[PDB]
């Protein structure tokens, strides 16, 4: 499912970041970086959910996971 | 009619810096989140707001990383981002 | 007919402050949620800094001066001094009243 | 008889709830005791920060010909102000976008 | 004349652990201070994470489960699982004795 | 009989319990929480001390110095991740020379 | 004018410990400015901590707390 | 003809020596004077403990060494072996200090 992040999506993300020209090897590296970041955040969120004895990962769990990694996110509680 | 190689890139940069909507499709990102979470716990359920927050955080992180990568590429007298630029940005940040 | 539980938020106070600073200006639900999260985060930051300030000095009470020192530590410069001025003015007015 | 009830926020001249801040401080596992003036001072600081951000966001919204603050206006207000940007440097605002910034070498 | 006020540190426990792991290796004063500061920092990290966990779940007590979740959230990879195993062993033995 | 002896631990369970109670962390502290925290602290201390002793023996020293602790922390991947933003006084840095700079 | 006390050999030694093989001549002023900014931040936090304690002596614990507040935890000084 | 090492042997020798050693690399008295001069702008007639100055020097040297490692990495990225102020600026911008 990592291939679901298509080349145009990565290009759009780079354009929002001000990138004008993109090498062909950027896409695999970006997919790997995104996978690592999501793995860390999701692992923390699942740990929070398991501590709560819940079976549904809530937005608050993701917010706490992000805040633990110094990535506080507003707009979700 | 054909625009020169870089006019459309600048146009897209302006368009996507004006805009604020998410740039990754919702369903593929949700499927990736579920696939990643499968390795941590089985039969997991996700709220829609949780997946939206994950998508927002991931896109913000990727945009910041691409900004740093563009800065690295400019530092090397280039206008094209390369994987070594991403690796250098992540190494200076303290992630690898 | 199950009434939802009471969820407290700073929405009304943020709206009052917005009407004070911009009478003919509104705020969306997402922006209100963002402002509420900002208020909560700053509250947590200042309260934690004051708590560790009290613990360092072996004190059991969080007072006005601990919060003032926390504000001076956490805010960047002019924001810090203006926040200190506003806080001292509010505390003086509250003490003067009753 | 009992006197008429006056809110502590009214005594302090503040819009933010002094009583709610005091209750949160007492039940937040911060310290064994909470002074009378600490909630007043913290409510004042929170109100000042909210006023600053809301004023800048209203200016941004008026610039964008809008009469309603959206997350984009909040992001623009925070990132255009140096001190607010430093305060929220590690904070991501949902649906906030990014500031227009194109490097000169790419022009 | 008067003895200095006693300052509690983890020196003797670190020395006992060192003698358990290295019977012939000693330790310097600066290294002992560094170990004490490391223990204090890890204790603060785990306790703060457990407190935040209890607050998030509207709980008033920090138990073995909250500390265990804090350990899983703070220690990376094999460190977390080994610490979990050691702690569960210690708690099981403690409850088995009295 | 000390609570540390019951759990088979060398770290002070009672002192950890008192610090948890007087640390403004929660209204109440469980009985097994100090045991678990003491066990975790003892395990981490044992790991770092074992690696530092190995470094000291590799440097022909019998006493652990801050240099040995720094080497032990930065040579272990997980310990380096745990103490990534931690500076050890008088610890120095690792002998790392970039391959491009070699003759 | 004590920033000049951080001499060129000191900056060169710090770079050598950092693994730098060749140093430009303009590096020293930039390094001095960066060091001044960092020391200004840390000393400001330390003086804030000392003033809150109603003390006139900046202690090692104040410096440690200032470094910890900035995410630069220091071991070996209490 | 007097003996002369080529331009880069002595630099590598210095790198090895200063990476093997752990002592502070900045002179103590100039650094103490700089600390006192900087602190004069925040509060007059300030006194400093010796351990405070030692900790400040340790932190400053560690920060400078890490910054120089990042600067060397940035300069190598630009296919150079010489560090320049632009490399330091890039490192501090990526770190998030500018």
UniProtKB/Swiss-Prot annotation, chain D:
What keywords is this UniProt entry annotated with? Acetylation, Chromosome, DNA-binding, Hydroxylation, Isopeptide bond, Methylation, Nucleosome core, Nucleus, Phosphoprotein, Ubl conjugation
| Name under which the protein is recorded | Histone H2A type 1
Q: Which organism is it from?
A: Xenopus laevis
Sites bearing N6-succinyllysine, chain numbering: 86
- Record-stated family: Belongs to the histone H2A family.
Q: What does the UniProt record say this protein does?
A: Core component of nucleosome. Nucleosomes wrap and compact DNA into chromatin, limiting DNA accessibility to the cellular machineries which require DNA as a template. Histones thereby play a central role in transcription regulation, DNA repair, DNA replication and chromosomal stability. DNA accessibility is regulated via a complex set of post-translational modifications of histones, also called histone code, and nucleosome remodeling.
Ranges of compositional bias, category Basic residues: 1-9
- Oligomeric state and partners? The nucleosome is a histone octamer containing two molecules each of H2A, H2B, H3 and H4 assembled in one H3-H4 heterotetramer and two H2A-H2B heterodimers. The octamer wraps approximately 147 bp of DNA.
GO molecular function ontology, one term from the record: protein heterodimerization activity
Protein's cellular compartments: Nucleus; Chromosome
At which residues is the cross-link Glycyl lysine isopeptide (Lys-Gly) (interchain with G-Cter in ubiquitin) found?
A: 4, 6
User: Its GO biological process terms?
Assistant: heterochromatin formation
- What post-translational events are described? Following DNA double-strand breaks (DSBs), it is ubiquitinated through 'Lys-63' linkage of ubiquitin moieties, leading to the recruitment of repair proteins to sites of DNA damage. H2AK119Ub and ionizing radiation-induced 'Lys-63'-linked ubiquitination are distinct events.
Where in this protein does the record say N5-methylglutamine is found? Answer: 95
Q: Which residues form a coiled coil?
A: none
Residues where N6-glutaryllysine is found: 86
Positions modified as N6-(2-hydroxyisobutyryl)lysine? 27, 65-66, 86
The residues the entry assigns to the signal sequence are: none
From Swiss-Prot, chain F:
How does this protein assemble?
The nucleosome is a histone octamer containing two molecules each of H2A, H2B, H3 and H4 assembled in one H3-H4 heterotetramer and two H2A-H2B heterodimers. The octamer wraps approximately 147 bp of DNA.
Q: Which family does it belong to?
A: Belongs to the histone H2A family.
Name by which UniProt lists this protein = Histone H2A type 1
Principal localization? nucleus
Residues of crosslink Glycyl lysine isopeptide (Lys-Gly) (interchain with G-Cter in ubiquitin)? 1
Question: Could you read off the lineage of the organism from its UniProt record?
Answer: Eukaryota, Metazoa, Chordata, Craniata, Vertebrata
Kindly list the positions at which N5-methylglutamine occurs in this protein.
90
UniProt modified residues of type N6-(2-hydroxyisobutyryl)lysine? 22, 60-61, 81
The modified positions for N6-glutaryllysine read 81
In the record, which positions carry N6-succinyllysine?
A: 81
**Which part of the entire protein is covered?**
16 to 118 of 130
A single Gene Ontology MF term assigned here is: DNA binding
The highest taxon in the source lineage is: Eukaryota
An example of a Gene Ontology cellular component annotation for this protein is:
nucleus
Subcellular location(s) per record = Nucleus; Chromosome
Q: In its UniProt record, which GO terms are filed under biological process?
A: heterochromatin formation
The alphabetical list of record keywords is:
Acetylation, Chromosome, DNA-binding, Hydroxylation, Isopeptide bond, Methylation, Nucleosome core, Nucleus, Phosphoprotein, Ubl conjugation
Give the function comment from the record.
Core component of nucleosome. Nucleosomes wrap and compact DNA into chromatin, limiting DNA accessibility to the cellular machineries which require DNA as a template. Histones thereby play a central role in transcription regulation, DNA repair, DNA replication and chromosomal stability. DNA accessibility is regulated via a complex set of post-translational modifications of histones, also called histone code, and nucleosome remodeling.
Native species of this protein?
A: Xenopus laevis
Q: Any keyword Acetylation?
A: yes
UniProtKB/Swiss-Prot annotation, chain G:
Query: What is the annotated localization of this protein?
Result: Nucleus; Chromosome
- Here the cross-link named Glycyl lysine isopeptide (Lys-Gly) (interchain with G-Cter in UFM1) sits at 8
The species this protein was found in = Xenopus laevis (African clawed frog)
Molecular function as annotated in GO: DNA binding; protein heterodimerization activity; structural constituent of chromatin
N6-glutaryllysine carried by residues: 8, 36, 54, 56, 68
Cellular-component GO terms for this entry: nucleosome; nucleus
The UniProt PTM text for this protein says:
Demethylation is performed by JMJD6.
Give the chief site where it resides: nucleus
For this entry, the protein name equals Histone H4
Swiss-Prot record, chain H:
Residues modified as N6,N6,N6-trimethyllysine: 20, 43
The superkingdom listed in its UniProt entry is Eukaryota
Q: Which residues carry this modification: Phosphothreonine?
A: 44, 71
Using the record's annotations, give every residue carrying the modification N6-lactoyllysine: 20, 43
Q: Where in the cell is it found?
A: Nucleus; Chromosome
Entry-annotated residues carrying N6-crotonyllysine: 20
Q: Where is the lipid attached (S-palmitoyl cysteine)?
A: 74
Q: Which residues carry this modification: Phosphoserine?
A: 21, 50
Keyword hit for Phosphoprotein: yes
Recorded GO molecular functions are:
DNA binding; protein heterodimerization activity; structural constituent of chromatin
N6-acetyllysine PTM sites in chain numbering: 20, 43, 79, 86
Listed under GO cellular component are:
nucleoplasm; nucleosome
Write down which residues bear the modification named N6-glutaryllysine: 20, 43, 79, 86
Q: Which residues in this protein are found as N6-methyllysine?
A: 1, 20, 28, 43, 86
Carrying N6-succinyllysine, the residues are 20, 43, 86
Record family assignment: Belongs to the histone H3 family.
Quaternary structure, from the entry: The nucleosome is a histone octamer containing two molecules each of H2A, H2B, H3 and H4 assembled in one H3-H4 heterotetramer and two H2A-H2B heterodimers. The octamer wraps approximately 147 bp of DNA.
Q: What is this protein identified as?
A: Histone H3.2
């Amino acid at each position: 499912n990592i291939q679901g992040i298509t080349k145009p999506a990565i290009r759009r993300l780079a354009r929002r970041g001000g990138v004008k020209r993109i090498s062909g090897l950027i896409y695999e590296e970006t997919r790997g970086v995104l996978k690592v970041f999501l793995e860390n955040v999701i692992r923390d969120a699942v740990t929070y959910t398991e501590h709560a004895k819940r079976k549904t990962v809530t937005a608050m769990d993701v917010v706490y996971a992000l805040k633990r990694q110094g990535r506080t996110l507003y707009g979700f509680g | 009619h054909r625009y020169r190689p870089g006019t459309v890139a600048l146009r897209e940069i302006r368009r996507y810096q004006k805009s604020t909507e998410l740039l990754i499709r919702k369903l593929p990102f949700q499927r990736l989140v579920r696939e990643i979470a499968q390795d941590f716990k089985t039969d997991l359920r996700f709220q829609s707001s949780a997946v939206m927050a994950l998508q927002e955080a991931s896109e913000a992180y990727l945009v910041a990383l691409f900004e740093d990568t563009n800065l690295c590429a400019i530092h090397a007298k280039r206008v094209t981002i390369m994987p070594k630029d991403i690796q250098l940005a992540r190494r200076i940040r303290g992630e690898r | 007919k199950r009434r939802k539980t009471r969820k407290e938020s700073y929405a009304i106070y943020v709206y009052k402050v917005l009407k004070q600073v911009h009478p003919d200006t509104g705020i969306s639900s997402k922006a209100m949620s963002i402002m509420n999260s900002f208020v909560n985060d700053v509250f947590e930051r200042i309260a934690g800094e004051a708590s560790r300030l009290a613990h360092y000095n072996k004190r059991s009470t969080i007072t006005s001066r601990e919060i003032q020192t926390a504000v001076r530590l956490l805010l960047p410069g002019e924001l810090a001094k203006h926040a200190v001025s506003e806080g001292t003015k509010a505390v003086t007015k509250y003490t003067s009243a009753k | 008889t009992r006197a008429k009830a006056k809110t502590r926020s009214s005594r302090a001249g503040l819009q933010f709830p002094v009583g709610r801040v005091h209750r949160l401080l007492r039940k937040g596992n911060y310290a064994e005791r909470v002074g009378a003036g600490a909630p007043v001072y913290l409510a004042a600081v929170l109100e000042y920060l909210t006023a600053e951000i809301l004023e800048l966001a209203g200016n941004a919204a008026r610039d964008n010909k809008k009469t309603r603050i959206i997350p984009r206006h909040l992001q623009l207000a925070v990132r255009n102000d140096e001190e607010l940007n430093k305060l929220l440097g590690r904070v991501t605002i949902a649906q906030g976008g990014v500031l227009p910034n194109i490097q000169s070498v790419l022009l």
